[PDB]
Amino acid sequence: LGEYGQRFMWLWNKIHDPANGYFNQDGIPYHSVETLICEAPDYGHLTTSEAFSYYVWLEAVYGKLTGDWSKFKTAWDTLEKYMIPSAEDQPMRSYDPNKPATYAGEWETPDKYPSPLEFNVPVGKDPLHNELVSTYGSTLMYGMHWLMDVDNWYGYGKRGDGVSRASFINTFQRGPEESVWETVPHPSWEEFKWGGPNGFLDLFIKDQNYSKQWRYTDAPDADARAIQATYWAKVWAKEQGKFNEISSYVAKAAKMGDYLRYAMFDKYFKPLGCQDKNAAGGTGYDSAHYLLSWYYAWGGALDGAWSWKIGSSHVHFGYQNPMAAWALANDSDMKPKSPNGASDWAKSLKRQIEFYRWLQSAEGAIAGGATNSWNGRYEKYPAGTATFYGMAYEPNPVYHDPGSNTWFGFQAWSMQRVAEYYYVTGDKDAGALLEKWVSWVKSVVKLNSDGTFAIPSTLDWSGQPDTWNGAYTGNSNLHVKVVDYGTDLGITASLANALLYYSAGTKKYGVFDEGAKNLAKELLDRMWKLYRDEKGLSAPEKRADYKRFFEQEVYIPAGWIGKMPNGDVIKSGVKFIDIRSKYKQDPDWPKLEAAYKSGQAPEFRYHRFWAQCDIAIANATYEILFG
Numbered sequence: 001l002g003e004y005g006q007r008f009m010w011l012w013n014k015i016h017d018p019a020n021g022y023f024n025q026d027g028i029p030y031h032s033v034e035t036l037i038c039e040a041p042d043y044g045h046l047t048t049s050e051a052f053s054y055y056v057w058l059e060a061v062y063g064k065l066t067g068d069w070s071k072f073k074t075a076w077d078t079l080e081k082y083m084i085p086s087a088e089d090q091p092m093r094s095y096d097p098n099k100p101a102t103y104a105g106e107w108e109t110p111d112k113y114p115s116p117l118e119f120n121v122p123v124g125k126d127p128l129h130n131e132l133v134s135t136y137g138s139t140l141m142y143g144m145h146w147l148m149d150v151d152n153w154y155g156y157g158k159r160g161d162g163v164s165r166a167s168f169i170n171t172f173q174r175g176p177e178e179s180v181w182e183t184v185p186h187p188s189w190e191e192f193k194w195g196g197p198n199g200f201l202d203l204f205i206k207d208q209n210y211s212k213q214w215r216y217t218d219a220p221d222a223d224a225r226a227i228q229a230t231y232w233a234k235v236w237a238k239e240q241g242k243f244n245e246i247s248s249y250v251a252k253a254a255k256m257g258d259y260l261r262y263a264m265f266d267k268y269f270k271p272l273g274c275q276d277k278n279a280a281g282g283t284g285y286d287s288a289h290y291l292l293s294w295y296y297a298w299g300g301a302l303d304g305a306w307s308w309k310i311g312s313s314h315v316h317f318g319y320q321n322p323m324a325a326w327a328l329a330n331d332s333d334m335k336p337k338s339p340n341g342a343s344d345w346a347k348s349l350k351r352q353i354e355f356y357r358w359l360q361s362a363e364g365a366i367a368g369g370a371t372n373s374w375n376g377r378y379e380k381y382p383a384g385t386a387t388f389y390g391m392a393y394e395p396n397p398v399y400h401d402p403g404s405n406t407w408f409g410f411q412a413w414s415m416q417r418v419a420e421y422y423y424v425t426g427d428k429d430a431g432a433l434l435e436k437w438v439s440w441v442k443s444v445v446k447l448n449s450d451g452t453f454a455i456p457s458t459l460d461w462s463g464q465p466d467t468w469n470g471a472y473t474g475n476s477n478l479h480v481k482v483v484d485y486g487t488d489l490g491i492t493a494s495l496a497n498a499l500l501y502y503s504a505g506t507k508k509y510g511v512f513d514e515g516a517k518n519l520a521k522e523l524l525d526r527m528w529k530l531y532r533d534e535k536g537l538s539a540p541e542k543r544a545d546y547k548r549f550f551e552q553e554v555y556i557p558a559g560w561i562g563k564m565p566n567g568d569v570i571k572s573g574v575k576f577i578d579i580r581s582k583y584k585q586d587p588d589w590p591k592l593e594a595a596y597k598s599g600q601a602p603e604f605r606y607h608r609f610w611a612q613c614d615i616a617i618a619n620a621t622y623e624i625l626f627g
């Protein structure tokens with residue numbers, strides 16, 4: 001084991017050291033060691049399917065370096081036990097594939113919700129349902145719900161029991177301007193035990209009456225990451241003569257991939273390009289965009305009177321995963337058991353690669369994405385809108401303030417997967433896409449003379465690509481700008497990881513790009529030199545946005561009154577902290593308050609679980625490819 005594999009082991013040891021507190025008492029990883037953090041989850045001991053996917057990934061690499069596949073198996077075991085809803089959590093009955101859901105608009109601001117159901121709006125057909133049921137013999141949807149309250153901090157428990165750990169919750173529901181600060185956290189299982197008279201439902205969806213019900217939301221990027229990780233575990237185990245220990249677990253990734261196809265469809269199964277909410281619904285695959293959209297979701301009445309499934313009309317390049325798609329399409333170990341699963345993934349692979357290329361800026365960074373539902377209401381695109389198989393270009397799909405593609409992180413996370421795919425296949429389009437993007441990366445990363453480094457933090461965009469017709473035009477009017485710089489260590493490591501796979505590819509298939517290998521190695525070494533600490537690695541970050549703890553009003557309709565499980569009153573006027581008063585018991589609360597009352601930006605050195613994973617994985621990757 002070389003220097004870099006040893007680097008992985010040390011961080012792995014930190015991560016798995018019970019005293020460091022990366023995991024709860026059940027072995028579920030938290031979002032971060034530190035509880036006082038707000039960014040996508042709003043509390044550090046929540047967890048995400050993202051974290052679970054990174055957990056699978058870390059252990060897959062451990063198996064590679066180690067020959068020991070127990071960690072990978074227990075990772076998967078935990079994932080399936082807690083993060084995928086069980087038969088009891090999702091008792092789906094009376095699903096209609098010809099009427100998968102009923103439509104509701106999306107609106108520009110949270111104060112426009114609850115969104116009214118519109119019962120006359122045509123909805124298309126779900127062509128997956130029957131095939132899946134036939135294949136698996138079950139109505140259970142095999143995907144991770146995205147958000148978990150690991151230690152029941154909020155207090156909803158499981159299935160409304162108020163007590164259990166590993167509690168399913170949700171937050172984001174109120175359109176493109178509901179920031180992490182502007183949500184009302186609510187249980188996935190709704191029995192009206194909390195909130196108002198109709199639980200939390202009528203903050204979000206307006207109906208004539210309300211039924212007790214469950215609903216879950218998949219984050220397609222996380223499920224695909226897990227599949228991606230399992231692909232590598234599969235080839236690594238095979239290399240060692242250990243495939244058989246893992247076989248039933250590659251089967252988990254295969255089945256997860258089978259259900260992940262829901263991410264490939266328009267929200268309400270409307271035809272691509274329809275631009276009319278009153279247009280008739282699609283009849284099958286005419287509503288598939290074949291990309292990994294922002295979510296899929298599914299729900300059911302507790303009494304079993306009905307159920308529903310939706311995809312998403314909004315697609316971000318940051319979610320795509322050609323490695324997982326390739327694996328599911330082409331690798332005989334990974335192919336889903338359904339008749340059309342592998343075929344659908346072959347279509348998605350090609351469509352994804354076209355999407356990346358279509359979105360590539362004049363400089364080389366990848367632009368945001370596209371939607372099949374302009375303003376989330378199937379409206380007519382403005383004149384001159386660039387399109388991709390009938391979908392409209394959006395610089396910032398889904399979230400507009402701040403825009404979802406203003407975060408540099410997606411460049412790394414997503415291009416890392418393309419880089420893997422190119423390494424595996426030599427795909428010329430991926431190679432060309434990566435070469436331009438690497439060129440851009442090399443031009444914006446700062447390797448300072450004094451041994452420090454900075455990576456882009458925030459990006460800004462202007463123009464649009466040329467409408468897609470199968471060939472990259474150079475997109476000379478689509479521009480990126482680096483707004484500012486930071487030392488996000490998770491993203492730094494991810495970026496190193498992508499650069500290394502690309503480099504290994506060019507050696508295997510073209511002219512070895514040594515410069516890319518060296519850029520990555522520098523990032524990994526300068527980081528190792530500078531940022532190690534007791535629990536792993538961390539870099540200081542000021543979080544001036546944390547004034548929103550105290551200042552951010554949460555929209556609540558006039559006259560609507562409810563309560564959180566801890567007794568916090570939910571009504572018009574409440575602040576972020578008013579519906580989360582347990583935050584006041586946080587060890588770092590005095591620090592936050594002192595910073596705030598003194599008008600100063602509090603400063604943190606966080607250990608985010610995914611970030612520590614990316615660091616560990618990136619170092620191991622150098623060993624694996626250049627060892």
Ligand SMILES: OC[C@H]1O[C@@H](O[C@H]2[C@H](O)[C@@H](O)[C@H](O[C@H]3[C@H](O)[C@@H](O)[C@H](O)O[C@@H]3CO)O[C@@H]2CO)[C@H](O)[C@@H](O)[C@@H]1O
Nearest residue numbers: 039040041050409457486487488489490540541542608
């Ligand atoms: O939603 C995408 C993922 O975001 C992750 O958090 C990021 C925050 O969104 C981002 O604002 C923050 O940026 C830091 C940066 O790390 C730091 O170097 C700089 O000094 O300050 C910025 C804060 O203004 O970084 C993190 C990126 O890790 C979540 O961790 C993740 O769950 C989520 O998917």
